[PDB]
Design a binder for this molecule. Structure first.
Ligand SMILES: CCCCCCCCCCCCCCCC(=O)OC[C@H](COP(=O)(O)O[C@@H]1[C@H](O[C@H]2O[C@H](CO)[C@@H](O)[C@H](O)[C@@H]2O)[C@H](O)[C@@H](O)[C@H](O)[C@H]1O[C@H]1O[C@H](CO)[C@@H](O)[C@H](O)[C@@H]1O)OC(=O)CCCCCCCCCCCCCCC
Ligand SMILES: *[C@@H]1O[C@H](CO)[C@@H](O[C@@H]2O[C@H](CO)[C@@H](O[C@@H]3O[C@H](CO[C@H]4O[C@H](CO)[C@@H](O)[C@H](O)[C@@H]4O)[C@@H](O)[C@H](O[C@H]4O[C@H](CO)[C@@H](O)[C@H](O)[C@@H]4O)[C@@H]3O)[C@H](O)[C@H]2NC(C)=O)[C@H](O)[C@H]1NC(C)=O
Ligand SMILES: *[C@@H]1O[C@H](CO)[C@@H](O)[C@H](O)[C@H]1NC(C)=O
Ligand SMILES: *[C@@H]1O[C@H](CO)[C@@H](O)[C@H](O)[C@H]1NC(C)=O
Lengths: 269, 98
């Protein structure tokens, strides 16, 4: 059901230029941003504090503030034993299943490649990560206060925090926005052929069905594009169909979405 | 080091003379540093809003650019991207029919 992700983006350009920016997502809705230019974590939702008090939130914000600083110089300290530019990414949070179950994760990439994870009670290099990581990671493991801190956060804080996020942001998370749809076409590279396009925009949540129809028969040639984000926290998708000139008549585009109330949108070419 | 992909689409059904929002959605690049320009008839568009940068499950960065725009019969609209992975800026033009 719900994936919560805290995404860290850290660039080291040289011995003394570096930046660490983060964004936090609950599903496809941004909950927070934290700019390198900024002292404190910023809310991007009215509910971004979840069920936590101000005392708990500040405490938790404090531990991330010490972390952003310590991460920076631990990494810098590491480089000066070894090649710039360095890009490190970190993806941390939890997947929320129904029945109050959950699973936490903490994955770290270097140069756009997954290399280290936190798992159970220790940091681990992922198989085929560079061997030079072994020593730094064994050394970091020897730091029990950091490792007890991470377990705490992954095992308790994350799901606990997410549960209040889901309560507090219910009317955003459970929101329904209707798709509006339109048709166009375009030539294709093979002479006497066309590509019909069915564009579907402005819908929420993500699950949708878009198919080109001839009566009741689904046109299996329907080619679904990727889900593309709009800027108003809705989705965009298009489905194309290649057809022969003349053979266009009677083709329809039909879209199904949870907010339409069981009445599909049907457009006719 | 990955090359950016560019998708340009409108928020609502285009119709000439009616105010709209044009999106440029830049995916799949690395490293995260990048310059995105939205262009009108080759002139850079002033008031362009960008999303915070983020990345997907496969680690590649993506970013949403968008501006207000009223489409007409004669105006062209493009999205240009400078990135370390590309010898040369990449431009993809909005095509209301695609
Ligand atoms: C939006 C809300 C959602 C909430 C749910 C979140 C779910 C996800 C959880 C994500 C949490 C991520 C982990 C951060 C947790 C944390 O607190 O870390 C703090 C820790 C704190 O360490 P610090 O250095 O600040 O201090 C230590 C410790 O401090 C203690 O006190 C802190 C609070 O004041 C606590 O944060 C900490 O847990 C701990 O209790 C350590 O335990 C002590 O033993 C140590 O002495 C101390 O050192 C300090 O003092 C000494 C001076 O005497 C100095 O030697 C030293 O430099 C430092 O000043 O700093 C670090 O460990 C940074 C290093 C992490 C790097 C791991 C990434 C792996 C890299 C991947 C490889 C890539 C390739 C490499 C490229 C070359
Ligand atoms: C946050 O949540 C995680 C779970 O997600 C907890 O991590 C687990 O912690 C326990 C106890 O520390 C770990 O259990 C120990 O594992 C050893 C074997 O591990 C291997 O086998 C298991 C599966 O078979 C794998 O998951 C693991 O990766 C290894 O391949 C056992 O040998 C240990 O038993 C021996 O030592 C203990 C001392 O702790 C003695 O008491 C025993 O009698 C025995 O001689 C031990 O049972 C467990 O493996 C961890 N899970 C994972 C998946 O890594 C964190 O504890 C939790 N943190 C907090 C603070 O709540
Ligand atoms: C560090 O990197 C930045 C480039 O992003 C540059 O402006 C700065 O001068 C660099 N420092 C030096 C002198 O190497
Ligand atoms: C990011 O933050 C650190 C600590 O505040 C600062 O010294 C650094 O210059 C910032 N990075 C940039 C490029 O502004």
């Amino acid at each position: 059901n719900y994936t919560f992700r805290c995404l860290q983006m850290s660039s080291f350009a040289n011995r003394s230029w570096s930046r660490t920016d983060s964004v936090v997502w609950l599903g496809d809705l941004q909950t927070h941003r934290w700019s390198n230019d900024s002292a404190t974590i910023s809310f991007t939702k009215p509910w971004s504090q979840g069920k936590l008090s101000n005392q708990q939130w500040e405490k938790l914000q404090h531990m991330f503030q010490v972390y952003r600083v310590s991460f920076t110089r631990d990494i810098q300290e590491l480089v000066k034993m070894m090649d710039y530019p360095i890009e490190i990414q970190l993806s941390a949070g939890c997947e929320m299943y129904p029945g109050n179950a959950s699973e936490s994760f903490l994955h770290v990439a270097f140069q756009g490649k997954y290399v280290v994870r936190f798992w159970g009670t220790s940091w681990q290099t992922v198989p085929g990560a560079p061997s030079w990581l072994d020593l730094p990671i064994k050394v970091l493991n020897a730091d029990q206060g950091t490792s007890a801190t991470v377990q705490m956060l992954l095992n308790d804080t994350c799901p606990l925090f997410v549960r209040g996020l889901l309560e507090a942001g219910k009317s955003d998370l459970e929101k329904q926005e209707k798709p509006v749809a339109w048709l166009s076409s375009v030539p294709s590279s093979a002479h006497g052929h066309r590509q019909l396009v069915c564009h579907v925009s402005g819908f929420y949540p993500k699950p949708v069905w878009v198919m080109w129809m001839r009566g009741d028969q689904e046109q299996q040639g329907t080619h679904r594009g990727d889900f593309l984000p709009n800027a108003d926290e809705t989705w965009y998708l298009q489905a194309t169909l290649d057809v022969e000139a003349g053979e266009e008549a009677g083709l329809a585009c039909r879209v199904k979405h949870s907010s339409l109330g069981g009445q599909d949108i049907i457009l006719y070419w | 080091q990955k090359t950016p992909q560019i998708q340009v689409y409108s928020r609502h059904p285009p119709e000439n003379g009616k105010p709209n929002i044009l999106n440029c959605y830049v995916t799949q690049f690395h490293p995260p540093h990048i310059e995105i320009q939205m262009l009108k008839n080759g002139k850079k568009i002033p008031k362009v809003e960008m999303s915070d940068m983020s990345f997907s499950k496969d680690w590649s960065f993506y970013i949403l650019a968008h501006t207000e725009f009223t489409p007409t019969e004669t105006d062209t609209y493009a999205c240009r991207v400078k990135h370390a992975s590309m010898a040369e800026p990449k431009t993809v033009y909005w095509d209301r029919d695609m």
